[PDB]
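dumping the sequnces here before i forget
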Amino acid sequence: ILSMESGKVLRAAIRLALDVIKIDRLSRTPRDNMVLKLVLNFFRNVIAIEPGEFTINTKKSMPKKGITSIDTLPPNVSMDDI
Amino acid sequence: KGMRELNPNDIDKLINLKGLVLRSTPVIPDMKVAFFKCNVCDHTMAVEIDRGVIQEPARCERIDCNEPNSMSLIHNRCSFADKQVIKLQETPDFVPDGQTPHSISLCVYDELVDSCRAGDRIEVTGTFRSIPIRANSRQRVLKSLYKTYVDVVHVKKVITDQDLAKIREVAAREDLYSLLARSIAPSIYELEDVKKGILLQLFGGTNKTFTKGGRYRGDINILLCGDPSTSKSQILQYVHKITPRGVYTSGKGSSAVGLTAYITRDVDTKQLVLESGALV
Ligand SMILES: Nc1ncnc2c1ncn2[C@@H]1O[C@H](COP(=O)(O)OP(=O)(O)O)[C@@H](O)[C@H]1O
Ligand SMILES: [Mg+2]
Ligand SMILES: [Zn+2]
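..and the predicted 3d for all of it:
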């Protein structure tokens, strides 16, 4: 989302927001408010996404080998990208 | 002390030895301070090494993170020192009844590394240490016989302005040529021209570095051919002593390859190497 075509998805969402707001306040229907809420939720989702957490089963004791790494990133994604 | 007079009584005591260097291993990195990094919190700590043992931590030293057995050794961030192993052969004189001379191993660290070359006579002061040998790789079991070696702490390989002021005084002497020609070979009698010719070989010509061509070297070659009983070999030995480098090769005792260089193989490295002949 942040990389493809320099993130023009955000510009498209903004354009939808402009189309919604253009109509008058007293003429606004619930659907317009739904669309505005959808755009805001889209922005919140884009901002909020963050790397997960490393969960490990604890049925038995810690082996003497121990934890090697807790990296939880996809193959092609590095920290700086997100 | 002699290499054949070291007894168990003299273990862990400072001794003095003299011998001939036979072979030295390349530089060996010896760990000094280890470096550990926690795999979870990426916390780094350095721990010391005592008696060849790493004082590893059981769990991360941080308070918030205490995951056990999560510490790993970063090999390339630990401090290291220099180690080298040398083999010393006792001087031929010490041999009692003409047998294979004994040898003693030496260890040198830090500055003394690469201080003695192969085929040199040195006097070394160090501690006569003893250490066990493990019977096999995969057990703590030890052999009852201990290996003996020496921990070297000192090695000695066996111009001032005043001298320059002194040397410049001789040059002013008018009869310098005769003085040097008479001092090069004191014993030989009435061979002043031969001595003079020999002397000019020691000094040598002048060196020239020359691009657009090749280097020109000022080296002089002299032939001494004459009647047998005259002092020819004596002068050869006399000059052989003075020069810093030289090989006393003879006739029918040297070979074409022996003079220039010999192609061989290094057993330790299993690579093709070449030795230096008499001329080289
Ligand atoms: N002018 C001289 N000065 C000193 N010693 C001489 C002289 N002439 C002959 N000798 C003696 O004679 C011997 C000649 O032997 P050497 O020098 O081996 O002869 P070559 O090497 O030519 O066969 C020497 O041992 C040397 O002591
Ligand atoms: Mg001769
Ligand atoms: Zn930690």
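The pocket of adenosine-5'-diphosphate (ligand 1) is lined by residues B 187-189, 228-234 (CB under 6 Å).
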